Design a protein around this ligand. Structure first.
Ligand SMILES: [Gd]
Ligand SMILES: [Gd]
Ligand SMILES: [Gd]
Ligand SMILES: [Gd]
Ligand SMILES: [Gd]
Lengths: 196, 196, 196, 196
């Protein structure tokens, strides 16, 4: 068994690194099943030459909306769940990670089907915040997913592989995704059906 | 569909900005319905020339009170819910936002009607805390709503409008509110009645 | 109605202040009823000449203990609830505040009566943490309550009074407490009895 | 009764200290019962010559996994519960502490027996984060537990002892553990059996 993090705390990634380089978000988000739950996923990249401490991910849905009392909220924001309640939004960023929001009754995608997706006018903002170990200062990195950039029925290609006692990242496959067999029913629709 | 935040993370607000200017709270709070829930709302302004990171909103009710055992607490504080449990108090401040506290069984306004409001002796303190991206240092901004400054049955005028691929803020309408048809029963009273 | 915090965010306490002075904890803790709940309370002082931002209170019970499998833990620590779940541990420190932990089924005092208190070998550590507005740096202040310093059946004297449009703190009464009629049954005992 | 923390806030540990020295994690983790619950425990060391403020512990399970839809996640991360929900991950680090994760239905060890443990291919990453009082800057310390370093049926030797009004740490016993009678059934298996 080859360790990921060594006893002294030094990780075993990017052979020979030094732990202004920018953090990266995959250009596309994917929707697909993970153990019977439909999921939205995007990938967040590491910083090749330093750790990010007290590092956390959060996501906002920007969507103009009308309240049942006729109040129109242009570009209304609402939180997307990405591990807040279990501390799974508290990231150990030492190689690109796939973040995952389970599309459940409380998720803003609960009733969005495959066909219905392209019709929607919405934007997912992805926001990484941490303190850069080296610099000492608190960072923030942002990016955005519009409808047309969320791919229904795909999965992220794996970028991690074990080479020579070290773990190495194929950063060419970072943004890379493949298709997978995935129902086109909305999570609600899937749940309704499973419930009989 | 015009993006709000671009792929690189730069937002599309305040054409040609630079991302000591003060943050702003609307001078008035409003109470009115949002999808069947009575709500207290105040508006919190952005910082025209920098982001605020790890930015969060919280609110305190200052109200002198007597305990059933005759203990009098002058200016007692208690937390007003403004998205703490869902991370919706964790703000993405890139244009003035309306903050909203749903007046429910756990809210200090649960039993306050319209008529009963002006009678009350209370103060809502609004407290924004974040780290200013540029400066590096942690900010705090405060303001206050006394009874006479909470307007029953109003809504905030919209300040956001899409001009020339950019989003622009009509800051003249910032503090601006209009009236809307809103029941004058207390949330409790509304709930009691709906529950038959 | 005289405001506590003004529109611009400046508070109306300590007429003519400047917003290394030390933060203070009352020398004694008290136990007594607040609306039918038995409560432990200690008082935490403000900083006469600056705000504390992102300010929070937490408390630890230090108590040596034996596990049912005969494992002895000298000075075991366990968290005392002082508003963590509702954000009421997130303090707006602009004048001495009484902190309050409701002694419930989950509290380490649940079964401790008045008579039984002096018998106990325990210590409450009180820990204030915030960033000092002026200095820029994160502070921590600590203090400690041993058995003999928790007073059963007392309440904290009020220190707040309204003088000349300003609110003024009688710091002589800070540590001051008076007695009040308070049952000597343990919270459990009180609950058992009330439950018939 | 000898105090642990004095009225002024100065602790009574490491007689005559000064409050780049490294923080320490015990080289081994142990699994054993604590009041009827099976538990994983590792020990986290203090910093002999300074406090760590806003100090917190978190743990990640690194484990390559396959989703029921055949998606393979190399080195998947998932949060181990170590007091997040009760604020018990918010540490008062003034002498080595034993951290403890109760192996319950939500824990990744729920179904892992004693025999089954050595078969498993998994790694627990332990991550301490706090601000170093003196330095002013935010620290992070890491270490790692692979299968072969988690000891089933052991307990950590005590390192705390009261010498001359001061508390002293036998740092030789830090990594020291002894065996204890401990069932070899998995937590699930223990729970199933207890439930009849
Ligand atoms: Gd912080
Ligand atoms: Gd490829
Ligand atoms: Gd207007
Ligand atoms: Gd007095
Ligand atoms: Gd020994």
């Amino acid at each position: 068994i080859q360790r990921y993090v060594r006893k002294d705390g030094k990780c075993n990634v990017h052979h020979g690194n030094v732990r202004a380089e920018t953090l990266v978000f995959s250009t596309h988000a994917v929707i697909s099943m993970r153990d019977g739950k439909l999921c939205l996923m995007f990938r967040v990249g590491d910083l090749r030459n330093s750790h990010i401490v007290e590092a956390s991910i959060r996501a906002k849905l920007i969507k103009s909306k009308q309240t049942s009392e006729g109040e129109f909220i242009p570009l209304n924001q609402t939180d997307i769940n990405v591990g807040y309640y279990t501390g799974d939004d508290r990231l150990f960023l030492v190689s690109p990670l796939i973040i995952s929001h389970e599309i459940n009754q409380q998720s803003p995608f609960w009733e969005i089907s495959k066909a219905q997706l392209p019709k929607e006018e919405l934007e997912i903002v992805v926001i990484l915040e941490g303190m850069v170990e080296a610099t000492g200062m608190t960072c923030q990195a942002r990016s955005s997913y519009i409808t047309s950039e969320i791919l229904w029925g795909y999965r992220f290609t794996p970028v991690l592989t074990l080479e020579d006692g070290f773990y190495e990242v194929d950063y060419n496959s970072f943004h890379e995704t493949y298709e997978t067999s995935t129902p086109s029913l909305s999570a609600k629709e899937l749940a309704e059906l499973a419930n009989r």
